[PDB]
Amino acid sequence: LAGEGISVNTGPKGVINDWRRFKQLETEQREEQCREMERLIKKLSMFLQQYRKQRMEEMRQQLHKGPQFKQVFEISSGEGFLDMIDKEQKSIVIMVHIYEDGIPGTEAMNGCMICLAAEYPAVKFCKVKSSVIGASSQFTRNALPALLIYKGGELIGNFVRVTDQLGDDFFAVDLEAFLQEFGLLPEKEVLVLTSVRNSATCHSEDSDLEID
Amino acid sequence: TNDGATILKQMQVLHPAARMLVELSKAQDIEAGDGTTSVVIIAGSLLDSCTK
Amino acid sequence: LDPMGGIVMTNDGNAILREIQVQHPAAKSMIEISRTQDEEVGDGTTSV
Amino acid sequence: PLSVFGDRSTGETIRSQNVMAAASIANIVKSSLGPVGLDKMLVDDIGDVTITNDGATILKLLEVEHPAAKVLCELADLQDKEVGDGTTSVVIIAAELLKNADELVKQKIHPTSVISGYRLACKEAVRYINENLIVNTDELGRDCLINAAKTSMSSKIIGINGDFFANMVVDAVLAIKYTDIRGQPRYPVNSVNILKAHGRSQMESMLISGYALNCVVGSQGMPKRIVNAKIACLDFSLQKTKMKLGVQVVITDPEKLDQIRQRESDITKERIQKILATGANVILTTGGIDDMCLKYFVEAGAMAVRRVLKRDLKRIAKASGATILSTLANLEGEETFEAAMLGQAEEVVQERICDDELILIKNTKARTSASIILRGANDFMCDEMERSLHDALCVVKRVLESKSVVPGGGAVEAALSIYLENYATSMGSREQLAIAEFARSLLVIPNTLAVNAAQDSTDLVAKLRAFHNEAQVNPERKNLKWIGLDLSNGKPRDNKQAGVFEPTIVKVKSLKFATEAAITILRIDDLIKLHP
Amino acid sequence: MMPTPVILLKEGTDSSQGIPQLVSNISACQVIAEAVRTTLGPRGMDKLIVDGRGKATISNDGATILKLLDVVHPAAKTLVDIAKSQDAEVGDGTTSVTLLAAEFLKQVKPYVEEGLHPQIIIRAFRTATQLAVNKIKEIAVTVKKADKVEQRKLLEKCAMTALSSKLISQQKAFFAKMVVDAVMMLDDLLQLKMIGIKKVQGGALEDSQLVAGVAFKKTFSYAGFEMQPKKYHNPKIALLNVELELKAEKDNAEIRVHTVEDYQAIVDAEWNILYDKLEKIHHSGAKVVLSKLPIGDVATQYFADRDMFCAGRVPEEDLKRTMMACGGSIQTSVNALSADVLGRCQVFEETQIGGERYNFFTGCPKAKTCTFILRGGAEQFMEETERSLHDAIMIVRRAIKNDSVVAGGGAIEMELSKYLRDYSRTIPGKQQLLIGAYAKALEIIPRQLCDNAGFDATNILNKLRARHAQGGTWYGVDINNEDIADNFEAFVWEPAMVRINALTAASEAACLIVSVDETIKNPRSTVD
Amino acid sequence: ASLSLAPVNIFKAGADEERAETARLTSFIGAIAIGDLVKSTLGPKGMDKILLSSGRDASLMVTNDGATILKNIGVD
Amino acid sequence: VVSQYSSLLSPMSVNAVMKVIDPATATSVDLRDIKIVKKLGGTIDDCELVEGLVLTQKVSNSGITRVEKAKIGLIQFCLSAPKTDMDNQIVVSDYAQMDRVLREERAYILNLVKQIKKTGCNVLLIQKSILRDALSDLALHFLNKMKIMVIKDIEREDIEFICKTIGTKPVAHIDQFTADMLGSAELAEEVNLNGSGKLLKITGCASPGKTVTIVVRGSNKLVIEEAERSIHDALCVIRCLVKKRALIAGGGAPEIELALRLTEYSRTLSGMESYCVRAFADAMEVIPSTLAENAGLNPISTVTELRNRHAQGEKTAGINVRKGGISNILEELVVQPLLVSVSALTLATETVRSILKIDDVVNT
Ligand SMILES: Nc1ncnc2c1ncn2[C@@H]1O[C@H](COP(=O)(O)OP(=O)(O)O)[C@@H](O)[C@H]1O
Ligand SMILES: Nc1ncnc2c1ncn2[C@@H]1O[C@H](COP(=O)(O)OP(=O)(O)O)[C@@H](O)[C@H]1O
Ligand SMILES: Nc1ncnc2c1ncn2[C@@H]1O[C@H](COP(=O)(O)OP(=O)(O)O)[C@@H](O)[C@H]1O
Ligand SMILES: [Mg+2]
Ligand SMILES: [Mg+2]
Ligand SMILES: [Mg+2]
Ligand SMILES: [Mg+2]
């Protein structure tokens, strides 16, 4: 065992294509690994006072009005999550819900997001199972109900165990008030019921022009 | 594209000799503006003869 | 059974069809038909 | 040896791959061509539904990965932008040209010879169309416009109702006519505001002899109808006055604060009073209006509409004779509003359309405008109606601008095929084969039309070709150039007498774009796809 | 589509129907055809295919290439099946069948895309194929003289034409003469098992020889074999089916004795049984002993003492070929070894060929069998030589059956195309288009020849079409001269049945492919 | 060119090839290492070695014999 | 790909090069004087050689287009509220002060616009500004009321080109804005490209500069990029013809002549260098082989015919693709400038010599 100063010549050069072959795959994998690591472990290791307006907010929150009521976006691929959070304009807030089927504390959250989506069309409420993301065993077993919030490509919401501060009977009013306490929900805008639609496309206007 | 310089610089060749030929095509484009394919073909043929 | 937790008891066609979530887009077209009939005249949803 | 971090395809492999991609794109939309064509119904995997027949829309919604298929997609988009009709036809023609050219290449014909033959064939086809197949609309009257609109709306959801829709389209187009400098009457389509609202049947669609706004009055105290409207178009918000960033209020004596705060709204009060003192009845602004100025308008019994779209406001100002005012400042440095800045209309109302309200500016003076309110069964049907209506409007604009039309129903393609087949014998030796293949490829349109009707395509196209050959051989049988296809009965028919017409620009632009795309794709013989 | 809570077929069933699936079938047939496209003609190229185990098979035969390809497309398997059928019935033209079938499908694809009913296409193919077969039978050249010299020359020319597409094409005259001689030495049935094919590594192709007799490798000599003489000048061969070694009398046999005298008697009885068999063989006058069953060391030494030759465990077909060449009979018992059942050859010798020992039985004057000993530098070399010789042998056998030939180089197909086009120009017109498409599709082989040779196929095809139209029947592609020539006068001959079967099989495959309109694939069970 | 340093790969996975430089270098290193290991046990004042078997038996022997030293070593 | 449109493009490129240079006493061509503008839509047959300038920026002052006898002015300051370089604030402690602030801002903007208008200017180009508002709505309204076209968001790096084309002199302060610093043009209009976009064209300039703009059209983006590259190739060819004004035949004739003459030269030498020069000639013989290939001809026969014809004395014998064989190419009009072959040979030889002086590779 001598001549340790090899100064290898072309072996790594001659296998550069095969080396990049799995280096790019590893980079792609650790992309989502680092995106998820920002959530795992760190938080897994651990009579106006009576809301007079809560009831009335509940009744006029039942203002679906338009076509149907839609549903939260369901993500079935981790790469789908990564290339939807990476894309899309960063001006508006992205909220993500983590869940596992059967566990209590999920249907109420989904209903709250469904009701809130109508209130704030700007927000991008979506849900995804913890299984597809690649969550850790502890996070899957006892940290599933969490409201992941992203804005500007970086985390803005640091919420896990939402049932701890919301219970299991929380309504959309409760979630809206709780989020507005931390100033994360975009402010509401005045809206009116269009007939159905007006615009078709935007291009060269070629408007009216009276000429001699 | 059909331009030799554009074809050569549009693909990562990953081999040092190929990279120097790409630089050759760029230089020929700078001085002349065409013949970028011809100069690379000539260099390749010259080195092929150098083999024997 | 409203997905938000409420209960809607009715025999009005428009409410029943509105509370149903469907995947086949022809069903979506039919539901939109129900909504249009309800908004235009306010009756005849089940009939249409 | 190359050591390139990517994949390489060379020779017949990449050519066949490109041809397969183009053929797949063509086969996607081949079933939506001609009156016997049927619509498609897309889903955007979030529940959104789009029922359509327009080829450009279908190819725009779909997500495409292959480069050649992309090339055909932007070909469709360009054909829509420059003409507005014949999108599916040009896509199909381009793909068929590519397929036949690739067959010729596989026969060991050099691609450059095929490209030269295609260029010659395209030039000669355009020349023959312009010299033999054009029909002038001067001697036809309004019937040619009506028939062109009906032909455009065939294969669309408004095909059967053409007898009414064509009249509406022609009236709308003729309402917005203007002659510019050098005396060329231009027809600015896209100035016809298309409004959709589900509800009553299709036949209840209204053509407004004026302008339609998708907005309502800002306050419920204002009147909902004014007979003799003096429209005031503004391009600035009417709110409480706020100082700019460079201006800051610092108070050292408390006695001035109340005066400052009062002036903060009295400025807008004075502006509103200046605007209203001229007799204005309708006030449209692109910006917002707060509650104070809304009450100010309420007390005067005048309209006030906020958040009006800029394009709609510009159209209203041009039609009514009003002038947009982004600010109140004459050339003397003062703040004034002349009465001459007011537009006029015979009525302004807020009608109810299916539990919703919209503002109609009826019969504006100094210019005639138009707008169409489409009534359907749901949102999807209204969208398809709007797309078909836009197609018909563009077709009518093309016909009225350039007064030449050509017979439809595949007559032009058959005549071109016969002429080019007879003409290829007089040019070159291999571009002869290229021109022959161009002529053969041009026959895909009548073949697709016949196939979509579940009729005998072979026999029908054979009869059409025989008719056109007789037309081109016998000098005294030149009236057979108009013999197209009648899809309802599956027999050849004189389309010029029947009333099937198209703008010549549609065929010319489609041929040119398809030839250019076929040439562009045919140049590739080697593909390098780098790993991302 | 709706969920239909109880679905009709098993979950995972795949169905495709209508024009798109037929177009897909045509495309798959094209894909299959282009795999063997470049193997056709004297400028053909071999193809290398590696299986899962890593063994490589280098071949130019179309049927072999298609078999080695693991085709799973239901429509594409038809081309492989018709290639196998052409190989079985004829033995040559396994690429022409695939090219013709795929070209038929490609030519009628545009009419399928236009909604034409496939039954019309099928009827058109049937009519065109019947007419083409009748024309081939009419214009095929035959000689009503039965001259032996003329027949030999015809067979040699046919063998040369068959062989002028493989790697042994350089020595095609040599191998054609060898094949013709070997086939003429077959008696009446032309059994292929009566022609031995021995492949020995090392040596040039011209070193390969045909033995007018029988030859086989030395088979596991026992001790004392090197003491036997290895050359005889008029040996009598004793073909036996006998185990000549000391062994138990029978599997169920059991010996019970109660005296040492009986023990010695039993031992001597076993030895005397073996020695009686050996002496019965020796007294017959034979000098060469061959046995299908093993011959032991005791028998080997016994024969070596008598200057005799023995070889046990001879392969059964080798023994049968020896019987046919020498004229003896395989004997399961040695009790009656008369002169009738003893073979006879002029010379027997054991020589070394490329590091192996081979036994040679030459000088047989009444032999009805042969043995090809092929030489080459690699195992695939001998295998491909054997495949080429098999093609030539099948062609020569078919020509022996009937000496009716047509010119090669695509001349027959250009003549057929001209005839079919002329016929199609006199029918109503729905069938005329399809028959003209068939006639144009018949032009694929000369075009493929020109493309493989690096020609310009269009100019050669135009010249051929003009020559056939203006008069001239056997004008095909002259590969060497970059032009066209009278292929009959150039001795590019081909048995008529080759083209007849090629056309028949291609038409049948095309009709079967066109007829099908729906493809249903039930799910794989037990994927494991 | 070279059997190993060629764009196409001609070996099974795990096969190797050392040309003149590397072959001579490895041969010389191995031979010199063996010589230096077995030496220092030479002559009247040579010393012995301890051979610890790494197997289950863990057999132990001390020897001055060069042949026995070289026999019981795993050499690559 | 533009071989079919060559009959249009080649005179266009020749004219473009001859426009931006002095035909006499010129030793180089600065191709930055020939701006290429790519607009999607149409066909390559729609390519144009506008002699003024084309601006992709839209006209802010909508409603007024196609000014005639234009007096274009280019400014580098901002038409907005006053703002000093150092940080500034306005303090208000009285309502009269509020009214005076608004009135004085209006008066300042109006005075700026009036001073611009007094010079006879009717087209205004405004350089792009970031920190300060380049064009306030009030200033735009005043300019509109005085019938002046306003075109804002002019890039900083286009100022030199615009000034060289129109003849305007940039104005960075209203004090120096006079009539003599304006550019006179025959017409300045905005033209729509049949729905594919709007271009702003200023055609016809008194005392025009040495700049031209080429407008490239095409059905899709890829063909437009390739057309731009091909046009640049033509311009570079004309530039190579400008310096070292020498011409040679194309068609592989120089390569085959090099092969033959260098074979003779090697035969005149001795030793290993004879073999090296023979190899050099054989390597130069590759371009005629590649040209005979890709055209369907037999490379060996065509190359041998070239060599034999050149040995006979035919210096201009080259590969002919139109006739499918070999013939004189000067009658085929296939010529290229000398400083293409010379440059390629010199650069290739230098690169080969550089590569040959390498014997090891070290990673890093
Ligand atoms: N019409 C022609 N006939 C024969 N040869 C030509 C013709 N046009 C160009 N060539 C040759 O093709 C060669 C390649 O030119 P081109 O592909 O345009 O640029 P590059 O020299 O960079 O490859 C040139 O050396 C020229 O001699
Ligand atoms: N009444 C008719 N009879 C026969 N053919 C028609 C009739 N109306 C339209 N066609 C043909 O059907 C085709 C339909 O074209 P279409 O698909 O609407 O164009 P696009 O590609 O813009 O969608 C046209 O090419 C026209 O020639
Ligand atoms: N000397 C030759 N000249 C021209 N063509 C030939 C010659 N020899 C064989 N052919 C052609 O080759 C074709 C057969 O090629 P081959 O590969 O031997 O068999 P297969 O038909 O199985 O491909 C025949 O059609 C024949 O016409
Ligand atoms: Mg060039
Ligand atoms: Mg009711
Ligand atoms: Mg249409
Ligand atoms: Mg054969």
Describe the structure.
The structure is cut from a larger assembly and holds 1 copy of chain A (212 residues), 2 copies of chain B, 1 copy of chain C (48 residues), 1 copy of chain D (532 residues), 1 copy of chain E (528 residues) and 1 copy of chain F (76 residues). Chain A is 39% helix and 11% strand. Chain A is an alpha/beta fold and 212 residues long. In chain A, β2, α5 (107-119) and β3 (126-129) form a beta-alpha-beta unit. Chain E starts with 13 loop residues before the first strand and ends in a 7-residue tail after the last strand. Chain F has 76 residues and is of the alpha+beta class. A two-stranded antiparallel ribbon of chain F has the order 1-2. In chain F, β1 (49-52) and β2 form a beta hairpin. The interface between D and G is large, with 44 and 45 residues. Residues 39-42, 44, 62, 92-96, 161, 164-165, 408-410, 445, 449, 477, 479, 492 of chain E line the site of one adenosine-5'-diphosphate. Chain D: It is an enzyme of class 3 (hydrolase). Chain D: ADP binds at residues 34, 86-89, 155-156, 409, 502. Chain D: GO terms for molecular function: ATP binding; ATP hydrolysis activity; ATP-dependent protein folding chaperone; protein folding chaperone; RNA binding; ubiquitin protein ligase binding; unfolded protein binding. Chain D: One of its GO terms (biological process) is chaperone-mediated protein folding.
> Strands across the major sheet of chain F, in which order?
1-2
Distance from first to last alpha carbon of chain C = 24 Å
Task: Give me the secondary-structure category of chain C.
Answer: mainly alpha
Strand residue content of chain C: under 5%
PDB class: chaperone
Keywords: CCT, Gb5, complex, open, chaperone
Entry title: CCT-G beta 5 complex closed state 7
Chain A: Phosducin-like protein
Question: Main traits of this protein?
Answer:
part of a larger assembly; 7 chains; A: alpha/beta; 5-stranded mixed β-sheet; 5 strands; 39% helix; 11% strand; flat; D: 532 residues; alpha+beta; 3-stranded antiparallel β-sheet; 46% helix; elongated; binds adenosine-5'-diphosphate; binds magnesium ion
What is this structure's SSE topology?
The structure is cut from a larger assembly and holds one copy of chain A (212 residues), two copies of chain B, one copy of chain C (48 residues), one copy of chain D (532 residues), one copy of chain E (528 residues) and one copy of chain F (76 residues).
Chain B (H helix, E strand, L loop, with lengths): L3 H7 L5 H16 L4 H16 L1
Helix pairs in contact in B: 1-2, 2-3
Chain D lengths: L5 E5 L1 H18 L10 E4 L5 E4 L2 H7 L5 H16 L4 H20 L4 H22 L2 E2 L5 H12 L8 H14 L2 E2 L5 E2 L6 E6 L7 E3 L1 E4 L11 E2 L2 E6 L12 E3 L7 H20 L5 E4 L5 H10 L9 H11 L22 E10 L4 E8 L6 E6 L2 H23 L2 E4 L3 H13 L7 H11 L2 H9 L4 H17 L9 E4 L4 E4 H4 L2 E3 H19 L3 E5 L2
Parallel strand pairs in D: 7-16, 11-13
Antiparallel strand pairs in D: 1-21, 2-3, 4-17, 5-6, 8-16, 9-15, 10-14, 11-14, 14-15, 17-20, 18-19
Helix pairs in contact in D: 1-3, 1-4, 2-3, 3-4, 3-17, 4-13, 4-17, 5-12, 5-13, 5-17, 6-7, 6-11, 7-11, 8-9, 12-13, 12-15, 14-15
Chain E lengths: L13 E4 L1 H16 L12 E4 L5 E4 L2 H7 L8 H13 L4 H20 L4 H22 L1 E2 L5 H16 L8 H13 L10 E7 L7 E3 L2 E4 L13 E2 L3 E5 L19 H24 L4 E4 L5 H9 L3 E3 L4 H11 L16 E2 L2 E6 L4 E6 L7 E7 L2 H23 L2 E4 L3 H14 L5 H12 L2 H10 L3 H13 L5 E4 L4 E4 L6 E3 H20 L2 E4 L7
Parallel strand pairs in E: 5-15, 9-10, 10-11
Antiparallel strand pairs in E: 1-20, 2-3, 4-16, 6-15, 7-14, 8-13, 9-12, 13-14, 16-19, 17-18
One adenosine-5'-diphosphate (ADP) binds next to helix 4 and strand 18 of chain D.
